[PDB]
Structure formats: C-alpha cells, structure tokens
Design a protein around this ligand. Sequence first.
Ligand SMILES: C[S@@+](CC[C@H](N)C(=O)[O-])C[C@H]1O[C@@H](n2cnc3c(N)ncnc32)[C@H](O)[C@@H]1O
Ligand SMILES: C[S@@+](CC[C@H](N)C(=O)[O-])C[C@H]1O[C@@H](n2cnc3c(N)ncnc32)[C@H](O)[C@@H]1O
Ligand SMILES: C[S@@+](CC[C@H](N)C(=O)[O-])C[C@H]1O[C@@H](n2cnc3c(N)ncnc32)[C@H](O)[C@@H]1O
Ligand SMILES: C[S@@+](CC[C@H](N)C(=O)[O-])C[C@H]1O[C@@H](n2cnc3c(N)ncnc32)[C@H](O)[C@@H]1O
Ligand SMILES: C[C@@H]1C=C[C@@H]2CCC[C@H](C)[C@H]2[C@]12C(=O)NC=C(c1ccccc1)C2=O
Ligand SMILES: C[C@@H]1C=C[C@@H]2CCC[C@H](C)[C@H]2[C@]12C(=O)NC=C(c1ccccc1)C2=O
Ligand SMILES: C[C@@H]1C=C[C@@H]2CCC[C@H](C)[C@H]2[C@]12C(=O)NC=C(c1ccccc1)C2=O
Ligand SMILES: C[C@@H]1C=C[C@@H]2CCC[C@H](C)[C@H]2[C@]12C(=O)NC=C(c1ccccc1)C2=O
Ligand SMILES: [Cl-]
Ligand SMILES: [Cl-]
Ligand SMILES: [Cl-]
Ligand SMILES: [Cl-]
Ligand SMILES: [Cl-]
Ligand SMILES: [Cl-]
Ligand SMILES: [Cl-]
Ligand SMILES: [Cl-]
Ligand code: NA
Ligand code: NA
Ligand code: NA
Ligand code: NA
Ligand code: NA
Ligand code: NA
Lengths: 389, 389, 389, 389
Amino acid sequence: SNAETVAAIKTLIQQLAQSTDQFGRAEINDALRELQYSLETPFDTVMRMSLDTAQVAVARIGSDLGLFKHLSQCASPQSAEELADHLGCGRELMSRLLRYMASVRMVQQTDDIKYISSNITQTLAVPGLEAGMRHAFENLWPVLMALPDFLAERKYPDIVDAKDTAFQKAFNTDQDCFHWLATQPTRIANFKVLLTDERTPNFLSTFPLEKELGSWSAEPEKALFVDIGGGMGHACIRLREKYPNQPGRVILQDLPPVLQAAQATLPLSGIESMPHNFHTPQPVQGAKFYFLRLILRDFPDHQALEILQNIVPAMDAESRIVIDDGVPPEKGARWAETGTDICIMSALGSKERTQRQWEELAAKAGLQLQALYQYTWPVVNAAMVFSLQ
Amino acid sequence: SNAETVAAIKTLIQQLAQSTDQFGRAEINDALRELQYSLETPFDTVMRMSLDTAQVAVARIGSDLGLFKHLSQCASPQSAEELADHLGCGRELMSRLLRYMASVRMVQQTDDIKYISSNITQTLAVPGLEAGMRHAFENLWPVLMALPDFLAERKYPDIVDAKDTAFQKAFNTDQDCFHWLATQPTRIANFKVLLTDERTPNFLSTFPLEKELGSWSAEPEKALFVDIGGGMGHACIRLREKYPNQPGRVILQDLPPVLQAAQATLPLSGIESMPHNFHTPQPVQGAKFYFLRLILRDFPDHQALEILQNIVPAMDAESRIVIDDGVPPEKGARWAETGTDICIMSALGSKERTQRQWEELAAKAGLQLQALYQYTWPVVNAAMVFSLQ
Amino acid sequence: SNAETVAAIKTLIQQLAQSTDQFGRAEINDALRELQYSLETPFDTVMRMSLDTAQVAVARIGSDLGLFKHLSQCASPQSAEELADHLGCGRELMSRLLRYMASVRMVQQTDDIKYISSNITQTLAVPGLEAGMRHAFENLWPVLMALPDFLAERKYPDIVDAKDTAFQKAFNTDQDCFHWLATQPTRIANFKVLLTDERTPNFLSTFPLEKELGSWSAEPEKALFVDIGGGMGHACIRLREKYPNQPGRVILQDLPPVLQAAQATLPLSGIESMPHNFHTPQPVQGAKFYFLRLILRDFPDHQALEILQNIVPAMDAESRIVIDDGVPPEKGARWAETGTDICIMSALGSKERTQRQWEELAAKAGLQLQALYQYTWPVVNAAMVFSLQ
Amino acid sequence: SNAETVAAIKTLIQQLAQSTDQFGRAEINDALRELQYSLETPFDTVMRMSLDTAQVAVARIGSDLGLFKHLSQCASPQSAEELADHLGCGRELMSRLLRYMASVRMVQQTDDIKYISSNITQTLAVPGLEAGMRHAFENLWPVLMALPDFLAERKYPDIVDAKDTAFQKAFNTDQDCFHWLATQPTRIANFKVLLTDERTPNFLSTFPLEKELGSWSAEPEKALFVDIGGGMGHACIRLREKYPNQPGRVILQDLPPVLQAAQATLPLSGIESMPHNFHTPQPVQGAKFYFLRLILRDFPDHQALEILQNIVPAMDAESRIVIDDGVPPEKGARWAETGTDICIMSALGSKERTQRQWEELAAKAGLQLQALYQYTWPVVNAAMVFSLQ
Ligand SMILES: C[S@@+](CC[C@H](N)C(=O)[O-])C[C@H]1O[C@@H](n2cnc3c(N)ncnc32)[C@H](O)[C@@H]1O
Ligand SMILES: C[S@@+](CC[C@H](N)C(=O)[O-])C[C@H]1O[C@@H](n2cnc3c(N)ncnc32)[C@H](O)[C@@H]1O
Ligand SMILES: C[S@@+](CC[C@H](N)C(=O)[O-])C[C@H]1O[C@@H](n2cnc3c(N)ncnc32)[C@H](O)[C@@H]1O
Ligand SMILES: C[S@@+](CC[C@H](N)C(=O)[O-])C[C@H]1O[C@@H](n2cnc3c(N)ncnc32)[C@H](O)[C@@H]1O
Ligand SMILES: C[C@@H]1C=C[C@@H]2CCC[C@H](C)[C@H]2[C@]12C(=O)NC=C(c1ccccc1)C2=O
Ligand SMILES: C[C@@H]1C=C[C@@H]2CCC[C@H](C)[C@H]2[C@]12C(=O)NC=C(c1ccccc1)C2=O
Ligand SMILES: C[C@@H]1C=C[C@@H]2CCC[C@H](C)[C@H]2[C@]12C(=O)NC=C(c1ccccc1)C2=O
Ligand SMILES: C[C@@H]1C=C[C@@H]2CCC[C@H](C)[C@H]2[C@]12C(=O)NC=C(c1ccccc1)C2=O
Ligand SMILES: [Cl-]
Ligand SMILES: [Cl-]
Ligand SMILES: [Cl-]
Ligand SMILES: [Cl-]
Ligand SMILES: [Cl-]
Ligand SMILES: [Cl-]
Ligand SMILES: [Cl-]
Ligand SMILES: [Cl-]
Ligand code: NA
Ligand code: NA
Ligand code: NA
Ligand code: NA
Ligand code: NA
Ligand code: NA
C-alpha cells in the first residue's frame, strides 16, 4: 500500500530527525530536497518551478490580512467563513487561500475542513520573520525578475558594481540599493523589524574568547568589543551574558535610528550605544575586537575594502578584526549559500566569499588571518579573526 | 555517522521509489516535501521562501544562454571556463550561475569542480518543457506579484471575472489575458511551443472505451471523437493509436493558426482538421464523444457554461461530452491542485472545480454525470462522461 | 479560280470568327460541321465514317510516343527522320503517322515536308486534355463497340440500370463501370489526371451570387458553399477567387484519395477538405449552397434521387441545392449533348436530362426549381438552383 | 446576331457549292473541315475525338433495325413511338437514338419532334453504302483499336508484312486478313454487297482510249481489255457502253463466287466472265490492256510485285498494264489518302503509293510508266499505263 509505505517513511525520518541535533536535522532536510529533485518527473520540475513562487505571494496576503497572527492565538479550529468575516476577506477568496495554505503547511486543515495554526503559521506571526518574508516579496523578487533581461541586454557581464546591477532596472533608478531604500519609508520600517530577528546559534558557541584574549588588559578605558553595524546589539548582549565579568568596554555602533530602536531591549548598563557610520574612520582606538557580522557580504570588494580601511588605522598590535559571515566551501556549496550569492549579486552587486576570497580581500587592507571558528553546519558561518600583517 | 545516516536515507528512499510505479513515486515525493516543511526551522522557512524564487530566474537565464541544451549533449564534464567561452557569458558570472545550478540539481558539479547534465538539465533542454518554465517566468510571475496589492486595494473581493483580476494590474491593460496575449508576438511564440508538450499518462490509460461505446454505430458516416480545442491533436493521435480498429470520424477542432501548426505531426490519414471556434455552435452532429481537455478550467462559470451550451444541441441520446480536467477532492487537496487554483484565479479569473462543482456546472447545461475515470494520482485528473439529462 | 474561292472562304470565316466571342465561334463551328454533312456525297459520308475513327487511335499513338509534348517545345520545323530517331519510332512508320496527322491538323506539314505544332498538337500535350483523349480510346470506344450487338441480343431494351448496359459486355464483367474501374490501376491513373482538366467558362461567369445570397448570414460559423464530389476543388478555388470578401465556410467534399490529390494545388487557407461519401447523409448543416457539378448525369434516376435525398435533411429554408450540369433542349439538341447521352447510357446506364426532367427528378426529393443560370452556348450547361418545396 | 451570321454563312457557302462541280465541292468540304479544326477550342478537340466515334456505332444500330431503309420510304414525318413500334425497338431507346441521329444529320428532326429522311438516311439505305459502313464497324474499327498497343509492344516497327500487323492481334489469329475473312460467312456476305457500289467518276472520263490504242488490231481473237479482280465488272460495262464499236474481247476476271454474283447485272453479250486467281499466271496472252483497279493497294510490295509478275509474261510489245488506284502527292496529302494508308497498314500490311513509289514497284517487274491519267481531284485516283521496259 502506497499510503502505508509513505506513512512509514515519515515515521522513520521523524524519529531519525528527533534524535540528532540542529546540524544533523539541517543535513537531513537538504537530503530530502535532493531526493525530491532527483526523483521528480520532467513535468514535476516544471510544475514546481511554476508554482512554488506562489507561496511568497500568498504569505504576503496572509500577512496583509493578519491571518497568521490571528490563527496563532485561536483556541479552537476556525472555519473559512469565520476567518473571512473576522479578517475582512471575501468568503470564497478566503476559502481558496486557506486550502492553498494548508496544502503547503502554512496552516493545517482539519478533517472537518476547519483551520488551525501549523509551525509555519507561528513562524509567519513572529514580527522579524514576517518581515523577512515581506522583504523577499517586495525587495528580492523584483530584482530576480529583472536579472535575466538585464544580463541578456548587457551580453552577460560580470557584475562588480552596486550602481550597475539588476536593482537599477527593477526599480528604475540610478541609485544603489541601500541609498534608494533609505528614501522609502515603508521599506525602512520593514527593515527595522527585520533586525529584531536574532539568528541561532551564534559565534560565542565556538569562539575561544579566553584563548584569543590571552593577557590583554582593559586599562585604561579600553574597549573589549566594538560591534560595527551591530543593529539591535544582539552580539554585545550575548557577549555580556556569557562573560559577565570580563573587563573592557562593550560598544554597539550603528546609525542613530537603529541605535534608537535598540534602546528598548539593551541592558540598562554595560553596553554603550555609539552612533557611527562605518564608511568613516573608526573612533575607538586599540580595541581588542572590532566585530563585523553580516556586514561585508553586502558590499563589492572595493567598498568592503574601504570599510576595513576605515578600521585598520585604529588598531594596535593586539587588536583584531573579527569578520562573522558566510564562508562557503570551494565546491559543493549548499542552496542557501549559492542562492544568497545570486540574490546579493542582483540587488547589491556583492558576492559570497570563500575562505580564500576573504583572505585575499583582507590582505588588501593589510590584514592576515589568525584563526577561523565555524559555528554553523552544513551552511558555513564562521568568526574569522584577522590581525595586522 | 551523520553523513552515513543521510546516505542510508537516500539509498532506502531511492530503492523504495524504484520498488513502485509512477503514482507511488508521486506520493513519495509529496511526503518528502511534507517532511521538509515539518522539520525546517523558522529561519529555514523564511530562507526557503526568500530563495526558491531564484530558481525560475536562473532557469530562464540558462535557457537564454542555451546552457541546458549544450550541457545535455556534452560527452565529458565541462569546466565553468569552457562553458562561459562556448556560450558567450562572463567567466565569473558563469561560474557563479553553475555553482547555484548545481546546488539545486539544475546541473551536477563533479568532484573536480566541472559540470555535467542532471535529469533537470535534460528536462530544461526539451522545447515544450523549457517553454513551460519560460511561461511561468513571463506570464505567471507577474500576475502573482500583482495579486497581494490588487486584493488589498480592492478590499479582498471574490474574483469572478476574467476582465477584473490581477492580470489587469500586472500588465496595465483592461483586456482579459486571452485577448491581450494574442497581441504579443513574443508570448505567442512561446505558447506555440508549449502546446507541443504532451502530458503523460493520459485518459486512454483507464478510459473503458469499448464499454462507453456500447453498440454505437459509426454507420453511415458518424463521428467517433471530436477533440474541441484539441491543440496539436495529441488526444486524436493517441486514440487512433490505441484503438486502430474502431470506426468513426476522428476530428481535431481548433483555431486556424493552431491547426496549421498541428499539420506537421498529424497522421497522414485518419484525423480530420476542422477549424472551429468553440464559442460558436458545434457543427458536428451526433458524435459519440465530444472531448474537452484542459479547456473549461480556463473559464469562469458563465463562460464555461456557454462553451457547454454550444455543444449540447448537437448531441443525440448516445452522444457524451467528456470533460478531461482536474477534479480536486473536497478536502486535503495537494499543492499542485491548489496552486493551480490560485494561479488561474489570478490570471484568468477562473478556478479548479471539485466533482460536485463540475456536476453543478454541467447540470446548468442540461447534462448529467454518467461516469468518471481517474487516470492520475495523487493529483486528480479524470475523464468525466456526461450525457443529456 | 477554285483555289482562290476556297482561300477567300477561309479568310472570311476566320475574320468572322475573330469578330465574335467564344459562343459565336462555337455556333460557327457547328454550322461548318452541318455544312460539311449537307454537302458531302454518299461516298464521302461512308469515307468519313470509315476513317474519322482513326484519329483517336493515331492520337493515342502520338501520346504513347510523347510526340505532341516534344513537337510543342521544338523551336524549328523537324523532319520525320529527326522525330523518329528522337522518339524511338521506325522511320517509315513515323513518316506515315506524321503525314496522317498533318492531314487532320494534329500537326502541321511545312512546304519542305517538315513538321511543326498546331493548336491540336498543343492541346494533346496538356496532361488533362491528353487524358481525355486517352479516356475516349480506352473506356468509351469499347463500350460503343459493344453497344450494337448488346442491343441486338437483348432485342433493344430501354437501358435503365448501371449494372445492365453495354459496359458489362465490353469488359466481360457483371460489375458496374464505377466499381470495375476502381480495380484497374492503369485506368485509375488516367482518371486522376483527367480530374485536373478544368472546364472553361464556369458557372460563376453568370451566377448572380449576391442576388442568390440575399441576406443570408454566415454568423455564427455557417457554410457558404459545400462542393459535393468536388474533385480537385476547382469550383471552391474559383468561388474564393471571384468573391474573396464573402464570409462563410467553403468545403470541398470527396473521397480520401481524391482529397489527398487535391491538396497540392488547394489554397493554403480558406477551403476545407472534408472526406464524405455522397451516398451517405450530408454532414454539413444549413449551408447556403450545396453544389453538385457533373455528378448526377452519371447516375440513373434511382441513384441520382438517393444522392439528392441524402442532402435534403441538412437544408434549412435558405439552403439551396445547385445542380451544375447539362440541360439540353426539348428539341434540336446539339451533337455534343446527344452524343454524351448515348455514351453515358452505354457506359453508366444514365442519361442527359432536359430542364423538365431535372425538375421531375428533384420534385421526387421534395425540391422546387427557383432559378436557372445558363453559362455555355449553344450546348447548354447551367447552374440550376433548387429550394425545399 | 449569331443566328443571323451563321445562317448567312450557310447561305453563301451553299450558293458557292451549287455553282461549282463535284471537284470544287470536294475542295470546299475539305476547307470546311480544316476551318473547323483550326477554330475549335482545346476541349472541343477532345469532345470531337471522344464522340465522333459514336456515329459508326449508331449507324450500325440503325442498319440492324432497318431504320434507314424504312424512313427513306415513308411519305410523312414519323414519331419516335411510331418508329419504335414498327421496327421493334424500346420506345425510350428509339427516341434517344433518333435525337442523336438528327444532331449528326443521319435523319432530320421536324419542329414537332417527328423524323424524316435526310441525304444521309438515303445513303445508309443503299445496300452497297450500308455495307461500307458495316465494314468500317466490324473490320476497320477492331484493327484500329488494336494498333496503338500492337505498336507499343513491338517498339514501333515498320509494318511490312500482311501476316504481322495489327489485324492478327485484333482477331487473335495468325492468318492474314484476306485468308481469315474468307472463313467468316457473314463478313463474306457483307463484302459481296460492298462490290455493288460503283465509284463515280471513273477512269474513262479522262482515258484517251483511241490515242492509247493507235493502230492496234484485235484479230485474231485478241482481248482489248482484261479486268483483273474486276468484281461486278463495272469497268468492262462502262468501257463497252462508251466504246460500243471498238473491236476486241472484253474479259472480266475474278474468283468464281464473285463472277456468279456479277451475272445478274452483266450485259447479255460482249463481256466474257473468266474465273481466274490473280496470284496465278495470266491466261490471256497479248491483250491490249490488263487492268488492275483498287487491287494492288491491298498488298505489300512483295505480294503486289508477285501479282504483276504473273501478268508480265503474257504481254507482247503492244500490251499495257493499267494500274487504276490512288496516287497521293509527295506532300500535302488529304485525309482520305492518309487515313486510307493507316487503315490498310493496320489491316493488310500494305500502303498508299505516290507516283514515284508506283514506278519503283513496277520497275521491279520490268515495267516503265508511259502515261498517267488522273480522273479525280483533290484526292488523286489515276489510270497509270505501263509497258515492258
Ligand atoms: C545585516 S544588518 C547586521 C546586524 C548585526 N551585525 C547582526 O548580525 O546582529 C546590517 C546593519 O548595518 C547597519 N548599517 C548599515 N549602514 C551602516 C553604516 N553606514 N554605518 C553603520 N551601520 C550601518 C544597519 O543599520 C544594520 O543594523
Ligand atoms: C490548454 S490548450 C489545450 C489543448 C488540448 N485540449 C490538449 O489537452 O492536448 C487550449 C486549446 O484551446 C484552443 N483554443 C483557444 N480558444 C479557442 C477557441 N475560441 N476555439 C477553439 N479552440 C480554442 C487553443 O488554441 C489550444 O489549442
Ligand atoms: C466528374 S468528377 C466531377 C468533379 C467536380 N464536381 C467538378 O466539376 O469539378 C466526379 C467526382 O465525384 C467524385 N466521387 C465519386 N464517387 C463519390 C462518392 N461516392 N462520394 C463522393 N465523391 C465521389 C469523384 O472522386 C470525382 O471527384
Ligand atoms: C477492291 S475489290 C476491286 C474491284 C474492281 N477492280 C473495281 O474497282 O470495280 C477487289 C476485287 O478483287 C477480287 N479478288 C480478291 N482476291 C482475288 C484473287 N486471288 N484473284 C482474283 N480476284 C480476286 C475480289 O473478289 C474483288 O472483286
Ligand atoms: C539581510 C538579508 C538576509 C537574509 C536574506 C535571505 C535571502 C538572501 C538575501 C541575500 C539575504 C539578505 C543578505 O544576505 N544581505 C542583503 C539583503 C538585501 C537584499 C535586497 C535589499 C537589501 C538587502 C538580503 O536580502
Ligand atoms: C495549463 C497551463 C500551463 C501550466 C500552468 C501550471 C501552473 C498553474 C497554471 C494555472 C497552469 C496553466 C493552466 O492550468 N491554465 C492556464 C494557464 C495560463 C496562465 C496565464 C496565461 C495563460 C494561460 C496556465 O498557466
Ligand atoms: C465527363 C466525362 C468525360 C468526358 C466524356 C465526353 C464524351 C461523353 C462522356 C459521357 C463524357 C463523360 C461524362 O459525361 N460522364 C462520365 C463519363 C464516363 C464514361 C466511362 C467511364 C467513366 C466515366 C464520361 O466519359
Ligand atoms: C476496299 C476498302 C475501300 C474502302 C475503305 C475506306 C476506308 C479505308 C479502307 C482502307 C478502304 C478499303 C481499301 O482501300 N482496301 C482494303 C480494305 C479492307 C480493310 C479491312 C479488311 C479488308 C479490306 C478497305 O477497308
Ligand atoms: Cl543526465
Ligand atoms: Cl480498436
Ligand atoms: Cl461535420
Ligand atoms: Cl482542500
Ligand atoms: Cl501552335
Ligand atoms: Cl466578395
Ligand atoms: Cl460540419
Ligand atoms: Cl433533340
Ligand atoms: Na475541526
Ligand atoms: Na470528503
Ligand atoms: Na491539504
Ligand atoms: Na420546345
Ligand atoms: Na438536332
Ligand atoms: Na412534322
């Protein structure tokens, strides 16, 4: 019986998944995707490419309606009619949207054709994750839609410049993406929510802080950690939480509106908020660690180099620049790494970098790699520790 | 060993897939997708929604470049430099595209970082399947991209009309999709190729023709099968192939440009080509089977009903209208069924129909359902046989 | 001078023939024949009956040899020796054949006893006209040769039946001519060519189509013209050519081998090819004109009536059956009209019909004559337009 | 007006014909045929070749019925019904035959659709002319029908032998025509009637008998005229009628059954009947004239030479052989001359001979041409007078 075989496959893979850790589950999930692609028929391939698109659009609709937030807090299954009436949606439209969502696990459909939250419902109700889905829809999809014709009309150039990539066609502007976004209020607002999502795990799970510090001393008034473009300051918060008695200043640097949004959730003491544009010379001199997490991936080499060159003059011999970012392998890179690469190429003109490419970029700033501490698998994120050459 | 467990899952799923038939494999693939969604983390969900989009754009680029056709005929692994030079693509752009393609099995990457075709490479080289992927990119994506704001601006109406749906916003026209496409030569050419893609399996795998014929006589000169909107005439070709000894006219009806396209590959004898617009009265009288495959799903009820009403006056008591189309269940419909429903709502104003919904529609034309012969699983396609009431 | 008077008669008859049109020339030629018969001596009459026979046999020989085609493309006079050597004929036989041919204008002999093409040479080089001469030799001659003894043996019956006429004696078969010919591949090939001979002028020279159409609507998708037994479709081609702006389907109906032959020279669009045996019910409903040209003369009344009865149930009140055929007068009929009558009696058991005889036949099928449009003189060919009674 | 023009042409040609003599009328008749052929259309040519055939068959039917003899003696116009009842013919068949006959002047149709004899009716009632038409039907038409395939299968030989020509295929025999006919009683009987038709004019109209005789003397018991194969003896009869007091025996030679048929109409004295086969040595020695009229045209050169070589040994210096036969011109020969040539080639293996060819044949027998006396025009018949070399 097919039904019996399929249910047995689900039972065994669930049991294997439960018994491993997050990294093993990620490896199982990638293997299931690989199996799906290897076993699908030719028309399956076309249907999946034709339709998987639609999930982002329907998630955006559900977010517009407040559906996921609402279903996440309901105590009993809801009919489509109840949901349509509550959320202000046409009843037939609501019913068709809910059936589609149930088929892709965005909600769950009961045996009496009512609706309850799934894992994905709960995810899409979390503000920062909702904001990620909304960002994919309004910022990533237009640049991906523009890329094929952008490349064709330009005879397939190597993209190297933030002011000359698919973004400019997609949004009919000569501005680079970051400059243009900062002129668009609703888009800015969605980004500020996006910063509230903290990734797990983080570099402190494998970073040997004591070993890296050695005998370093914080007197007088030296900084232990300068978080450059630190956003809500999650790295500063976690560092103070794990090492509450390490001396040295811990400093969150970002632009004033971001530091303003961070104040609500910062500890009342132990972390300084310091407005600072990372395209300008670094004000804190001789800090132990200058930390750049998910910063330099967003810039082509020329601009990423300029960001590093604003920091290096502030370093002393004990200073390190810690780049915490993706470090895809030389071969066999996974879909999240390469898909990121194609997206940031299209929007920002930038690229993912292997270890060798990070080293080549850093050497242009007069830095050499001392240590690399990976903390996620199988997609590689690592804290790369650089010193002056 | 984590790697060892994942490789054993792959081996056992591959062997179970070989242990069954195409319908069992379709059920296994749906289960693999369900498992992926149930085991992904919240961040994973957002990453998958953000990036799976990119596959369609990158397939479109590969198609523009002729990459899939070229790789599918190579006799050895090719480097990225070789492919770039051969196809006229920037070397770095080509390398980054190939790495992305390999991570989603659109090509395979070898251990020495060269590239060979995968099953998906071969699919995307086939003109009718390539044309489906191109159709998704250029026609389906824009209407899905317009849908959330269309609904928001109109306060979530029930879409009922081909002239008032997302298509009009997507393409800035007051025409309906069918009327607009006929003005756009680029899109027309791709549709021409798309019509050459024959789906498999087809209704003749389960249709009990001799049972349905009973004692019908083709004498004196009656028509056995009238393929209304039959496209390239695949249904007529397969009927004559499976039932070479059954007498009766076999008639392909379509518009003149489509008929002229069909001539190249129609049998030299045995199948008539008859120009006929199915919005006008059916000219062939007293045929045994009037066949409508993937026609009525493209029309809202009012228009679908008109197409049926144009056939009914030609029927005698033995005639049947055979609707070959999707028949999703009352609940638990699969993602290809509900995704189709949302896409055709957005582009055409139409809908997928359950068995009860088909019966209500056909009852309005004076028809009753005599039999239903499913021929695909788990997504339901079936030949529904209707008689006069 | 005797010679001078004869040459002056030739000059004046030639100038009068140029002074008039094709119908006046046909009347002059009939008068010339009448004069010949009235002025010949009794011996002359016997000599003419004994020898005029020979022309058909000698034309058949010239056709076998390819003589007419070859002479028609020669740029200078040819001697008998040159032609014999070129065509592979005995020299003395060739010389004697050419002298005979020149004496009956099948070629012309020059003053230095060489040969050039005449009008008749050119005619016999044309495949459809050559095929008519070959048809006379191989099909008509044997039935005429059998007729006197057939009648004598059967004590001069009224011939009424296609299965009981001279044809059966001539070819020693109990089949009727149409059934027997379809077993004889040599004769079939010649008939194929014979169908390519288009007669001129045709009914459209005098048929008042717009008058006969009145306010008939081709909407929604009605048929303007159904050419029943239309052969190569010449009537359909000329209709579309003279009336390029009149809407309505134009449909050529014949048997499949004839339709396949017609495809080479049919327009690329505008004329449908529909296989249809005219002994079965007419499938096209409500056409304006159902056209039968040179069909019903080949059938005795019982069978001609059946062909008409197969059309009548398809007619609506505006439909007309148009019989395009010979309509000889009540008296004074010309030799081509009565000769046709005796030949088709002998081969097919059928007959020429006067206007009153056509009306009696059509009345048996429930039809009435609305109009008659002659288009040749003095031998009467006319498009007779019949409606429902 | 066409009718007025045509009637004026008939009036003027009739008046011109009446005012000339028989030779001028023959020239007018040939010119009318030539005009007909030069002015006919291509399809006219085919129709005339298809149909003029039928006249011989219908004349044969009329002869079988006794129609022409009967109508020739009726005193008033007869209806078709009256004729059918009187002659034992189906009424509808009779009516169709009479309409056909009237259209080719074989009878005349009155304005009230009754029937009276024409010139041709009277001709076909004369026994010997009737027998000529019957001979054309039963003997000439089968050999002409066999000729094209006979020549094709033998790759177009020069026909030179009476035992190897179309006759043998036509009648499935290895006999020569004369030998075969003498075994067929009805055919023999028709030939004996054929001999009763006397041609006009004859050679005595221009033969200068007195000049050719000079001083020749009939004593003792010498013959003036020996008519070899003389048939009914018309030449002997006319010679005695024109020169009743020329001395010398006048001797009719033929085979016994022909001499028997001649007795009824020979003068009771002055002409001897002498059985003699002209393939055997001539018994009458030293006659003045040995006369061969329409004999040698029926034999190929070898046999014609043998006939002459049986006569020459009987000649003295004053003897002449007089060949009275066709003498076609070197060029421009008329249809009756060349058609005769093709017919006797096909039946007898023989040929028409020009003056030069007669001289070459006669020289092989040791004869030289002394004088040639033509007596018909434009088709040449002449008495050619030969002496010993
Ligand atoms: C991708 S978010 C990374 C946040 C943080 N490093 C983390 O991982 O938790 C990029 C951050 O860079 C900040 N940023 C952008 N442009 C900046 C600039 N010119 N100077 C300083 N910060 C900037 C943004 O405000 C945002 O907080
Ligand atoms: C989705 S394709 C279906 C083809 C075919 N039934 C099959 O399954 O193989 C839709 C077909 O309808 C035809 N079509 C569209 N409008 C039509 C009309 N008004 N009359 C007749 N055919 C039409 C198209 O030309 C096309 O061939
Ligand atoms: C004399 S041809 C006439 C052609 C045509 N009507 C014209 O005038 O140009 C007779 C035609 O009848 C067709 N025919 C003979 N039997 C037929 C049948 N049973 N059904 C349909 N066509 C038939 C022949 O194939 C042929 O093309
Ligand atoms: C064409 S008819 C010519 C008659 C005659 N010379 C005339 O013109 O009035 C040929 C004649 O030759 C005769 N004939 C045929 N064979 C013969 C033979 N072997 N010997 C003698 N006469 C023969 C026939 O009987 C017939 O009368
Ligand atoms: C922060 C963003 C983090 C998550 C996204 C997931 C999918 C790939 C994409 C690539 C990243 C992300 C990233 O890695 N960097 C920059 C942008 C970005 C894209 C368009 C406009 C502005 C920013 C991103 O979408
Ligand atoms: C079979 C059509 C082709 C394949 C699509 C697969 C995914 C859903 C989508 C819905 C179908 C399809 C369909 O089912 N009907 C009509 C259209 C269509 C869409 C836009 C313009 C023109 C036609 C389609 O894309
Ligand atoms: C138009 C046909 C062809 C031309 C002929 C001209 C002379 C009279 C004759 C009578 C017609 C014709 C005709 O009119 N009808 C049918 C036949 C026919 C005869 C034998 C076998 C098959 C067909 C014909 O020869
Ligand atoms: C006497 C014959 C005289 C008249 C015929 C007129 C047509 C030409 C044909 C040629 C002649 C004729 C002739 O000239 N000679 C011999 C035969 C003949 C033919 C077949 C069998 C037997 C005799 C004839 O038909
Ligand atoms: Cl492969
Ligand atoms: Cl079968
Ligand atoms: Cl039809
Ligand atoms: Cl459902
Ligand atoms: Cl010419
Ligand atoms: Cl027109
Ligand atoms: Cl039809
Ligand atoms: Cl008549
Ligand atoms: Na429930
Ligand atoms: Na159910
Ligand atoms: Na479902
Ligand atoms: Na009349
Ligand atoms: Na007449
Ligand atoms: Na009369």
